[PDB]
Design a protein around this ligand. Structure first.
Ligand SMILES: [Mg+2]
Lengths: 297, 289, 289, 289
């Protein structure tokens, strides 16, 4: 249902507020340069530090600006399913095509608790859900048997797998007996994931290099792993630099270098070191040098 | 203070809302039966599933009913320091003695980001802060050098250490040169922690056995570690059973057996299995008889 | 130098002694049914419980019986480099083509200690080395910068990567600038590894299904990851059953069902449960055929 | 029945050999200066890089030189129980009072495999066994129910708990009813462990500060935890410096500063950095006047 390069969108700020002009421009620029889909207001979009009003406004503005050109999968994460229901219902009303749902961070519930959280969101809306499995941030882990129970629900349609355990997709595929949108939640292993049955990635780096990242994803989907790895290798220095300090500090700074938005993030995300800024700048300049050298029409 | 048996209070519910009557009764009962302090709307009080209004209401009701009889340390946790500031400012207005602050869960910031979060809360209020270090739930870990930097601020006055790493207190004590309220965040190792320089515990089990838990804590503070271990040995089965399934399901059920509140918690906390319920019932029967 | 499906050979026993008859038969059968190389006396071959002399005699037999038909990479693991040198020197004299070397388990040395271990083995022999990186068993982890230092040595020619960290190969590849045999040490992620730049796997499950595993590896080297994944899906139940209890108990039992050897392993590897045996038997029947 | 400060002895080397003269002198010096027991040829004694001949000779020499003044608990660790049996049998014939046994590193057996390993050693000797639980090095973890199963054997008499999980002793004490020597395997948390029911520590730091370490242990055993913590605070910098780089590099160098032996260890243990040497030198100077 949802395939390829799906961008975990940054949220631009100006004078302490959502930068609506920059956000609209970002949607247009990302679509122009090869986004296969957009995922506003996940943690890369600073969902934890947006107000409930800002969260909904960003989703609404992205859905409006996309104009149906690519799918929009709205973040509806919370550790409280009552809150997640509110985000998901709004997303549906604002014209999002699906929602992305993490559960259980900090309160650390059982598998049954995770299941009931997701069932609550599922039963409250009419659009599809991608469940978000990210033990490295949430501690809790949606286990394969739980994933299979979730897959029995008609509108749980995929997973953003940020476990970094590449055996996990195999364990899930052994238990899930319907088509399922397996999506990587880790840029560094996106190729490994698609070779293992994945069909895309909800990506941070695609904010910055949407054209290359789209080409890489399409190559994996067309079975051309030689071409995909070639592009992955080009992007590896960028990946390292974008994640060296806690994301989205890196992506926000990189986007500022491209003239897309201000570099600012909200606490507890902090400004980059001068060394990290320098490394990002040099990497971006090199990618542009290479593109200009190789381009011809 | 802050010292001894500090109760990580459960939040009672009734028909989907905060049970204000049970909450007032719980404050009275816990104080009557030996609480050294009360810590409303932490993790155990289901801070994640309370609305902002409910969080503030629970803090206000607990401070009101406590009537200054014991210290009240209000939860002011969030992964957004803007929100944490709102809880902490309300807590001060409501008469809390201090706030307990976790930071950085899920967004997973750097040491500098954690520092800036706590500094923002610190600068917005006049009451002190106990920082809450709980990597097993938050992933982020306030490292010893960061704790020392925090301790340089006048109103960062202690830590709830839920790392479960009993070497950590030693590493922090090596770097902190002012009096500091080192508090355990783990009931099972409360004695170990105080023997290593700790001066209390923000405790889940104390909801249910406040008298015995208070006696245990006081024994450690008076240097009678033989007596402390004797009581620990009585409480260890309770500790295990209250954490067998994800807390606070266990504490809420246990309190319901004591007639203190309804057993219900909010999703994603779920009802206990019949086995866990039975084991808790047996433990309560043994303790209160 | 090494590509495709390489088998981490089991070592068969009878009355607890090495069954040389079964071992020679296993070499012939595995080569007949599609092995690309043989890797005797790793942990799958129970290196930890073979005496030094048994280890050497097993390597010699496999090298001789292989008769140059496929490469033989002899295990020369130890946490003592002096012992590893003895294994590697014997392997060379016995006609092994290369050695597979783990280091640092239990004693848990630094990166420099690991480097010096491998350099000692390297400098003592004339045949090449595959470095074995397996933090899940050894705790120590050869970091990418250390791997690059190792690759600078002329006869370090590849790695068996059992980190299960699929980002690791990218990090090593960026730093290594000569032909280098990147080999998976994890059956479940073998396809992922090859998609990421790997060129084969030193496999446990290939002991039992060498023909299908050979076909899966071939597909990845052809660039047909769709066919590779279809084969992986056929082998999925087998992988799970072979690793349900601590390996090599599973592989040894499966090989016994094929008539190749007894199921016996040496303590602390223990007999399988009847459920695991039943599941493996069913899987073998489904595959064969 | 084993209590207090039990030294995880370093093994001194000279010209690539066991330094017998230094070893005898070390036994005498450590006993003179307050050792409550001696534990030769564990990993601090570089058991992984000693030959079988050296392992046995070091045990024999330490038992001989101790002359029954303090208990001698010989290392008989291996991931192969057949090898462990040989070490333990020799230890007994050499006059050791007990053996210390780790199992299962690298091969990573099941709980049943660990049990069978220990049972095999148990049944082969007449002297008692202290089980060595060290997941940080061995990965395998002897779980509380397995420890209880081991405790049902008559000559399994204690544990060296190097889990660094201070809840573990509580979980074990909840299951074990017979007299049992609970011993810490972690210097930094030795006080915490004894406050939780432990009765000693098999200690690395006690190699270097036996007098202070013995005083600290005795203080815990007498219930004087204030005194124990005072001494712990004096020793904490030493604990940190001795484990900064992979042990026993730190302990061997510190002992060399005291004139007890040469600083050398065997690969993969490597020489200390100048910074670490300087820090150890400053700590030694501070302690010894
Ligand atoms: Mg092709």
């Amino acid at each position: 249902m949802f395939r390829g390069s799906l961008i975990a969108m940054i949220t631009p700020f100006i004078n302490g507020q959502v930068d609506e002009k920059a956000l609209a421009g970002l949607v247009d620029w990302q679509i122009k340069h090869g986004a296969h889909g957009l995922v506003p207001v996940g943690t890369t979009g600073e969902s934890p530090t947006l107000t409930e009003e800002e969260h909904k406004r960003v989703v609404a503005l992205v859905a409006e600006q996309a104009q149906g050109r690519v799918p929009v999968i709205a973040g509806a994460g919370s550790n409280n399913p009552v809150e997640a229901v509110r985000y998901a219902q709004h997303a549906q009303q604002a014209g999002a095509d699906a929602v992305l749902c993490v559960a259980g961070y900090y309160n650390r519930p059982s598998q049954e608790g995770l299941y009931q959280h997701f069932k609550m969101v599922h039963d409250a809306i009419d659009i599809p859900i991608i469940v978000y499995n990210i033990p490295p941030r949430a501690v809790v882990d949606i286990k394969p048997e739980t994933m299979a129970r979730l897959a029995a629900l008609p509108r749980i349609v995929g997973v953003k797998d940020a476990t970094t355990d590449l055996a996990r997709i195999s364990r899930e595929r052994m238990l899930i007996n319907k088509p399922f949108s397996f999506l990587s939640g880790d840029d560094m292993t996106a190729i490994a994931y698609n070779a293992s049955g994945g069909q895309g990635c909800i990506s941070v780096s695609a904010n910055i290099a949407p054209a290359l990242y789209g080409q890489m994803q399409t190559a994996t989907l067309q079975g051309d792993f030689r071409e995909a790895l070639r592009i992955h290798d080009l992007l590896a220095p960028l990946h390292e630099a974008l994640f060296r300090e806690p994301s989205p500090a890196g992506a926000k700074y990189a986007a500022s270098l491209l003239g897309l938005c201000n570099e600012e993030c909200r606490l507890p995300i902090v400004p980059l070191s001068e060394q990290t800024k320098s490394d990002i700048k040099n990497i971006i300049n090199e990618l542009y040098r290479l593109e200009h050298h190789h381009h011809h029409h």
